[PDB]
Amino acid sequence: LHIPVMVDEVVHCLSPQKGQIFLDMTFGSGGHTKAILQKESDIVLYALDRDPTAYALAEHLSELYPKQIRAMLGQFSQAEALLMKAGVQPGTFDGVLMDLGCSSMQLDTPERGFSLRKDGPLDMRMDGGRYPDMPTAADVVNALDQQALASILRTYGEEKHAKKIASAIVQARSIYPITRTQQLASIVAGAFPPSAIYTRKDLLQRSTHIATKTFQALRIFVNNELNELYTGLKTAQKFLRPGGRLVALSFHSLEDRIVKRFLLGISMTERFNLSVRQQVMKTSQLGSRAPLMWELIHKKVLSPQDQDVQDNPRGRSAKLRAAIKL
Amino acid sequence: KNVLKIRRRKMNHHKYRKLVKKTRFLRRKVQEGRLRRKQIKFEKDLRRIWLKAGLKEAPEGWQTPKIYLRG
RNA sequence: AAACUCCAGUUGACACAAAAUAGACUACGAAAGUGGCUUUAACAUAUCUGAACACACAAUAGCUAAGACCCAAACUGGGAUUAGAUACCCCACUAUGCUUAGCCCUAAACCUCAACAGUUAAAUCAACAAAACUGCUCGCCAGAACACUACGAGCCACAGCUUAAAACUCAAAGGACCUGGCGGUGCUUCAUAUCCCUCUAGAGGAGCCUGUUCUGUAAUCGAUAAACCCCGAUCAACCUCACCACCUCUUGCUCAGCCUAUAUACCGCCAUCUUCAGCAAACCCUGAUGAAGGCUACAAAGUAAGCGCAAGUACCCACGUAAAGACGUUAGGUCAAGGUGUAGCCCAUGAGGUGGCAAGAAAUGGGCUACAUUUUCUACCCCAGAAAACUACGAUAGCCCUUAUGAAACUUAAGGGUCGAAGGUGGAUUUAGCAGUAAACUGAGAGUAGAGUGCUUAGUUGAACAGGGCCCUGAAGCGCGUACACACCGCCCGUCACCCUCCUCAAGUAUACUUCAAAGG
Ligand SMILES: Nc1ncnc2c1ncn2[C@@H]1O[C@H](CSCC[C@H](N)C(=O)O)[C@@H](O)[C@H]1O
Ligand SMILES: [K+]
Ligand SMILES: [K+]
Ligand SMILES: [K+]
Ligand SMILES: [K+]
Ligand SMILES: [K+]
Ligand SMILES: [K+]
Ligand SMILES: [K+]
Ligand SMILES: [K+]
Ligand SMILES: [K+]
Ligand SMILES: [Mg+2]
Ligand SMILES: [Mg+2]
Ligand SMILES: [Mg+2]
Ligand SMILES: [Mg+2]
Ligand SMILES: [Mg+2]
Ligand SMILES: [Mg+2]
Ligand SMILES: [Mg+2]
Ligand SMILES: [Mg+2]
Ligand SMILES: [Mg+2]
Ligand SMILES: [Mg+2]
Ligand SMILES: [Mg+2]
Ligand SMILES: [Mg+2]
Ligand SMILES: [Mg+2]
Ligand SMILES: [Mg+2]
Ligand SMILES: [Mg+2]
Ligand SMILES: [Mg+2]
Ligand SMILES: [Mg+2]
Ligand SMILES: [Mg+2]
Ligand SMILES: [Mg+2]
Ligand SMILES: [Mg+2]
Ligand SMILES: [Mg+2]
Ligand SMILES: [Mg+2]
Ligand SMILES: [Mg+2]
Ligand SMILES: [Mg+2]
Ligand SMILES: [Mg+2]
Ligand SMILES: [Mg+2]
Ligand SMILES: [Mg+2]
Ligand SMILES: [Mg+2]
Ligand SMILES: [Mg+2]
Ligand SMILES: [Mg+2]
Ligand SMILES: [Mg+2]
Ligand SMILES: [Mg+2]
Ligand SMILES: [Mg+2]
Ligand SMILES: [Mg+2]
Ligand SMILES: [Mg+2]
Ligand SMILES: [Mg+2]
Ligand SMILES: [Mg+2]
């Protein structure tokens, strides 16, 4: 079982109260959505997900609360149109809970293809066939050139060995099609000496497969999570009430940066991890930020309790960024 | 000139200081035991002297001091 | 931002802290060190050398104890930046820097030059540093690494200092210098249809033509980043043809043949930098006759020749455009122009006949025609009349029918009829052009029986801008650094529960081995 990550913080943060309408742009399993419909019995809630399996769960769970929860299906970009059909263009949503990442059910079910450990079709697509033409991870690896595929790994996977892990994929695909998760994992391992398979470690300091950065990289290029995250936040702002509390959850750095640089106005094209020294050097050259539209409830990113991390290691990297619209 | 010989010594000293840090409690127990044996080895050397000279006990009023203790 | 707001400014009072200027001086001291003022004491030796340990000292940091505390400040807390943590920045504050009394005994404690005496003549001298040496004495050294380590010993030192190995391992390690490459390297000047902006017309969107890719097919090949992609082809209905299927021939059009493999064996002919100016010899001289270097015009070691540039020539000039453009670079292109080395086939990988493929789910390059009013049609070749949005502009496409060529044409070309579509001037990006050029328009030629919206070429009308800069692009000159040389996509260092070799420590525990009498009553 997967407990909703930081459910206690997200509930306190949004303080759901009677007379307030809320949105959920990532229903998924619905653990967070259900934790929010428990504290306040008079709450109004809206749900959304990219997975039709997740949208069916919400529809089945809608029986528990007939109108307090309203289920919707679609991507972040398509969310505004879907909600615009309802007619809530101003929205006046008190809070938008934009949980991020892959659902526990999505990656616990081997058929969905998200787990390298198990053997499933190399789908790695949050979409559940709602768009049967949407390329899957298998398609991405078999088509793109080394330079193109290396960029996917480098930019989205934070993978130093992008050229080494991409060349192995290019050679492997020629010999046979890459259609299964384990088939890819073995190819990526084959780019390195056999001992490399578990040399790398996580921040938890527990050995991880040497292809855990290629499964994350493709997952984010197949589902365009990063570009869809920028529109998703923007749409929330337009549909978010003034004085309404937004709450995001970033499990990896790339998504965390966008949430940080969006709630603070920082340009998305600035250099990453800028030090104070570099900031001085940057502006010294020019010598020769706009008003913020948010009020961060908690100034610094929250993180899961160390005890809770061991119980749910999947959510160890959950960085909660809360803000109030201005 | 280059500093490659200095750099080798730098790394050697750094790793030594790092090894000493990690094992400073084991090294302290070892040093204590060596000093005990050192004191015993010293006590035997003095006993050998009076025994080889024909005496059966230490000279009257002689107590071998502890010359290796921190005190 | 936090912090402060008994804050900030003026004025006055006020240190156990630190000592502008002088100091551009180069003094004192054994060294370490010593630069505010005064006073006291005071800076060993009438031959030199003489210690890891004796004797006495020894920056900074640090320890112990007691004080002082302006300011600084490891650490720590807060703020900020950060995906986040630490650091870099900001604020506060501590050990500490100070005093006293004890310790500790280290430094790139380095003029990286041992003390003393002497010499400037010899050879000046591997190199660099810092001109080269002699006598004499002490200290020290003998491949790298292990190793400022282990053990032993000493020490007020207890995560310490001093002295300081061996085993395993390697064929180098190292010093100086030169060249090259490279620098998130300095400065400087640059590109002239160009690196960017600026000027004009385009491409990228539509249809069509055509190449390529992919897919398809029983059914070629080659080119394929710049430097492939209307390229070999100034050209494929048969032929061409090298491909596929079937059938046929065997000293075969040839004193056979092979479009079989290898362009990474080659000649031949070329692409490319080149929209370059350098290349290769023969000598001479400098550096001690080292790797190397060789210019100053009021000239200081370079020079008599070759190739390229240049000159000259072609076109309408001496301008411009052609042509030319070395060596070298990309084992660049071509064995399928032809020839040919090597290897292979010889009833077949050779030869001949018949028929056939040569398509489009698509993607992409180049071109053509358009989207119209500076336009469309007609007359005319510039003083006109109409057209001008669902019967307009717009297909060189589709369909149908004729004609031309051919033995052969749903297929190729031309013409007519019908049809009247997308397109409404095109995001990122990108091409070309400095003048009779771009842009627009018109003709001719090569090659075919015929066949391109392709190519080659003649002519007509005929512009705009040409300045300002150096992030990116690349260039040059003068520098600097370099542990790279496979040349930064380099190299090395640290790290890690894979591995073998060797060594050390060590709890208790036995195990042998050595010692006594080398004595006493
Ligand atoms: N661009 C996007 N638009 C909508 N939903 C998305 C999305 N990207 C991811 N998601 C979905 O959002 C969810 C995030 S992970 C699951 C979190 C959820 N609150 C739970 O019940 O666990 C997944 O269901 C995922 O499929
Ligand atoms: K002073
Ligand atoms: K001075
Ligand atoms: K020095
Ligand atoms: K150099
Ligand atoms: K265009
Ligand atoms: K050649
Ligand atoms: K040939
Ligand atoms: K040949
Ligand atoms: K075109
Ligand atoms: Mg070492
Ligand atoms: Mg403030
Ligand atoms: Mg003396
Ligand atoms: Mg001695
Ligand atoms: Mg001495
Ligand atoms: Mg000493
Ligand atoms: Mg001292
Ligand atoms: Mg002190
Ligand atoms: Mg202070
Ligand atoms: Mg203090
Ligand atoms: Mg003082
Ligand atoms: Mg000094
Ligand atoms: Mg001496
Ligand atoms: Mg010399
Ligand atoms: Mg040695
Ligand atoms: Mg030392
Ligand atoms: Mg030692
Ligand atoms: Mg010792
Ligand atoms: Mg086009
Ligand atoms: Mg071809
Ligand atoms: Mg080829
Ligand atoms: Mg070839
Ligand atoms: Mg090429
Ligand atoms: Mg034929
Ligand atoms: Mg044919
Ligand atoms: Mg043949
Ligand atoms: Mg070649
Ligand atoms: Mg002439
Ligand atoms: Mg001329
Ligand atoms: Mg020419
Ligand atoms: Mg010429
Ligand atoms: Mg080649
Ligand atoms: Mg041949
Ligand atoms: Mg044959
Ligand atoms: Mg019409
Ligand atoms: Mg027609
Ligand atoms: Mg006829």
Swiss-Prot record, chain A:
Family as reported in the entry's similarity comment: Belongs to the methyltransferase superfamily. RsmH family.
Recorded catalytic reaction(s): these are: cytidine(839) in 12S rRNA + S-adenosyl-L-methionine = N(4)-methylcytidine(839) in 12S rRNA + S-adenosyl-L-homocysteine + H(+)
EC id: 2.1.1.-
Residue sites binding S-adenosyl-L-methionine per the record: 30-32, 49, 76, 99, 106
Species of origin: Homo sapiens (Human)
Q: GO biological process: any one?
A: rRNA base methylation
Gene assigned in the entry: METTL15
Name the record gives this protein? 12S rRNA N(4)-cytidine methyltransferase METTL15
Q: Where in the cell is the protein located?
A: Mitochondrion matrix
The molecular function terms of the Gene Ontology recorded here are: rRNA (cytosine-N4-)-methyltransferase activity
Q: Which residues of the full protein are shown?
A: 71 to 407 of 407
Q: Which residues form the signal peptide?
A: none
Task: For this UniProt record, give its keywords in alphabetical order, as a comma-separated list.
Answer: Methyltransferase, Mitochondrion, Phosphoprotein, S-adenosyl-L-methionine, Transferase, Transit peptide
Report the function annotation for this chain.
Answer: N4-methylcytidine (m4C) methyltransferase responsible for the methylation of position C839 in mitochondrial 12S rRNA. Involved in the stabilization of 12S rRNA folding, therefore facilitating the assembly of the mitochondrial small ribosomal subunits.
UniProtKB/Swiss-Prot annotation, chain B:
Its annotated compartments are:
Mitochondrion matrix; Nucleus
Its GO CC terms are: intracellular membrane-bounded organelle; mitochondrial inner membrane; mitochondrial matrix; mitochondrial small ribosomal subunit; mitochondrion; nucleoplasm; nucleus
Q: What is its main location?
A: mitochondrion
- What processes does the entry annotate via GO biological process terms? mitochondrial translation; negative regulation of mitotic nuclear division; positive regulation of proteolysis
- Give the record's keywords alphabetically: Mitochondrion, Nucleus, Ribonucleoprotein, Ribosomal protein
The signal sequence is none
Expression across tissues: Ubiquitously expressed and especially highly expressed in heart, skeletal muscle and testis.
Q: What does this protein do?
A: May act as a negative regulator of Aurora-A kinase, by down-regulation through proteasome-dependent degradation.
Complex formation: Component of the mitochondrial small ribosomal subunit (mt-SSU). Mature mammalian 55S mitochondrial ribosomes consist of a small (28S) and a large (39S) subunit. The 28S small subunit contains a 12S ribosomal RNA (12S mt-rRNA) and 30 different proteins. The 39S large subunit contains a 16S rRNA (16S mt-rRNA), a copy of mitochondrial valine transfer RNA (mt-tRNA(Val)), which plays an integral structural role, and 52 different proteins. Interacts with Aurora-A.
Annotated family: Belongs to the mitochondrion-specific ribosomal protein mS38 family.
The protein's name: Small ribosomal subunit protein mS38
What is the organism field in this record? Answer: Homo sapiens (Human)
What range of the intact protein is shown? Answer: 128 to 198 of 199
